[PDB]
Design a protein around this ligand. Sequence first.
Ligand SMILES: *[C@@H]1O[C@H](CO)[C@@H](O)[C@H](O)[C@H]1NC(C)=O
Ligand SMILES: CC(=O)N1CCc2c1ccc(Cl)c2Cl
Length: 351
Amino acid sequence: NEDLRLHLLLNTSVTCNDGSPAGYYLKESRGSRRWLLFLEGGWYCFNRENCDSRYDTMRRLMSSRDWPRTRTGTGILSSQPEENPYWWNANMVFIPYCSSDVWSGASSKSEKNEYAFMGALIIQEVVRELLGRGLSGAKVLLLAGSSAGGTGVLLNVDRVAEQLEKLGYPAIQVRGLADSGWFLDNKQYRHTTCAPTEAIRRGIRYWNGVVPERCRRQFQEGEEWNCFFGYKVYPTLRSPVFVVQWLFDEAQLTVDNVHLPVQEGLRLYIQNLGRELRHTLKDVPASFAPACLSHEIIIRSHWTDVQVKGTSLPRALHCWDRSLHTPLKGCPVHLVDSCPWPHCNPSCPTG
Ligand SMILES: *[C@@H]1O[C@H](CO)[C@@H](O)[C@H](O)[C@H]1NC(C)=O
Ligand SMILES: CC(=O)N1CCc2c1ccc(Cl)c2Cl
């Protein structure tokens, strides 16, 4: 099945990196008032030099020129209850990542600018055009996303909520689901701008990157890079946000320059990383954090398989839905592994 259909943005001034129109894939579900808007990930580029390289061999992340007319919804975007016990009947939207800016930019390609970085505006424009296609009648809009899309959720969920309030739709409940987008600005295991802190600092300047207002007001000018880190930006958010995060995320380990017989130094580094991640989730009431070495989960077809403390992610998300109607009997929403080494959870993806 190729069930989500491409719509290029009617406002063609909201563009991918190269000035081609951004867009979204839609599969409508009549009668359902649930809308799932999923932000694709795919790293980023923070200067002309690496953006030019990304344009040569990763061009679909920078242009809509070669996008197919349809995409198959998989995992949480699947309409089959067997693949998606959580939201199989929802209206499904897949928003391709073609701005290379962690969904934070609001700058057009112009005289001074070889590339457009419009991720924040892309989300705004998708939401605006969807209101005329059924979203106006929604009761829940779940803004989900994986990897850089997961960080995009944290950066944009409150802006979507404010956008709908100002447009006159206060009844739509905007919620966030951030998958694999909860990073630590930690010490690298070996020094190498791959390090998470420096990459984001350069990005905002290059991108015209914007961050949630309450977080911006805490860290102030020149320090907005802090708001790309989940444990710093999450406490400032008003919309409900469910956090999915492997304790030993492969992209975290990459920017940490960890490449997998492990000796004491690396063992301690890996164990400290998991404990740090676990600590940052202690006060996140809706979270699913398995002790696995892996990367993304929610649009993979076997996303149903992993469990924490006996509860799957689709179940935990259903429990979260119920909690948003005191804790529920047999329906937990805070699921963080406590064991300290990759794959100490037997349900981790096999690879
Ligand atoms: C098109 O999008 C741009 C970027 O946000 C915005 O400035 C402009 O007002 C939009 N125009 C229309 C007609 O929607
Ligand atoms: C793969 C990816 O997308 N990565 C890895 C590091 C990172 C990403 C996305 C957002 C932020 Cl803040 C950070 Cl540190």
